[PDB]
Design a protein around this ligand. Structure first.
Ligand SMILES: NC(=[NH2+])NCCC[C@@H]1NC(=O)[C@H]2CCCN2C1=O
Ligand SMILES: NC(=[NH2+])NCCC[C@@H]1NC(=O)[C@H]2CCCN2C1=O
Ligand SMILES: [Ca+2]
Ligand SMILES: [Ca+2]
Ligand SMILES: [Ca+2]
Ligand SMILES: [Ca+2]
Lengths: 199, 199
């Protein structure tokens, strides 16, 4: 029946983070920075556009629940103004597109809440989750879920291949995208899962 | 409490077409040609990149059913090779984006079967349905449905505004896109519906 497709660091649990609400500002291992508009610098600091992992643990000040999975989430934060472009995470998989298969891609998407000393996390940039083969977006969920301040929700993306799909044999891939359509312009992702089932 | 947002020629019934499977090759009334990659020329023939309306009535060569709604559908056909770009239909509405409102866009999407002038309609280019405010895509369904050869299915796109949405007061819009990701690379749309409801 259903087969689980392996993904590296699928719940962003590497690296380990000791202190609740702490976070890194480098690309998490197993992933790459999707950067089509060059918004995220090679060298990041507290003060730049950045991505990384963050510990959403007991006593977090910024959510009304914990990480969907384990300790950590993956986040993308953009400093540039709304409409400047998009960025996020990308992972190309070893699995290839096979014919007469239903693919289901699930990812949790989180909306950071609250304030800190004049800083405000109110609002949300929009998200898109993409399933790729090669560099083709086969299917994507472009911001269809409403995500309340301080909660996560599961996005579901589906593609069904045919006997004669043009992209057959190409490497499957995943992209988790910050749309930068409004601010606060950070968002969190967690618990990436991909399954495949013969139609 | 649910309110219908008016759309012009929402079912592509204008213009009336007398003979089953006959069609126009010009932009349907009430719509514009979405053409970001310049795939569709200003003057069209049968078999050039084009769009139009077609009559899907009793004894159509292309479906196992009649049009989702009334007589007609709106089609977009792209002659160029896969990867060349996208094109379709756009309509800017008079309604504007309002706060704390749940928007639901539904569109029927058709995978043509059969044969036409000795060409197989086997295969499908992929679709995307978009809800806009101004020139921003608020939410979109990028090709998540599996549509069998010779059937229509309903795409649903949803967006929820907040009190402080950046695009509040901007004009709502709809785009119906042919993705040109595979061949046969034409597809049909019908029965565009958009509703709004206070959250
Ligand atoms: N879940 C995230 N995306 N990141 C971790 C929580 C927010 C993160 N940690 C903090 O302590 C607050 C201080 C204000 C800025 N913050 C941050 O950027
Ligand atoms: N699309 C329909 N259901 N009916 C109209 C068929 C004709 C319409 N116009 C054309 O020029 C041909 C090109 C190939 C596909 N076409 C079309 O879809
Ligand atoms: Ca996790
Ligand atoms: Ca927020
Ligand atoms: Ca119709
Ligand atoms: Ca077909």
């Amino acid at each position: 029946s259903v087969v689980s497709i392996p993904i590296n660091n699928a719940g962003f649990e590497d690296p380990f983070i000791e202190v609740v609400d702490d976070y890194t500002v480098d690309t998490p291992p197993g992933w790459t920075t999707y950067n089509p508009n060059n918004l995220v610098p090679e060298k990041r600091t507290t003060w730049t556009s950045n991505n990384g992992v963050g510990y959403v643990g007991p006593g977090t000040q910024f959510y009304n629940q914990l990480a969907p999975e384990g300790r950590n989430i993956g986040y993308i934060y953009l400093a540039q103004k709304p409409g400047s472009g998009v960025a996020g995470f990308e992972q190309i998989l070893d699995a290839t597109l096979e014919p007469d298969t239903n693919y289901t891609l699930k990812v949790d998407v989180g909306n950071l809440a609250g304030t800190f000393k004049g800083l405000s996390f109110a609002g949300f940039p929009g998200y898109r989750v993409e399933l790729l083969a090669g560099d083709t977006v086969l299917a994507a969920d472009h911001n269809n879920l409403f995500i309340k301040e301080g909660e996560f929700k599961t996005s579901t993306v589906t593609y069904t291949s045919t006997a004669k799909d043009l992209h057959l044999g190409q490497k499957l891939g995943i992209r988790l995208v910050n749309l930068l359509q409004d601010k606060f312009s950070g968002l969190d992702f967690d618990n990436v899962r991909l399954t495949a089932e013969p139609t």
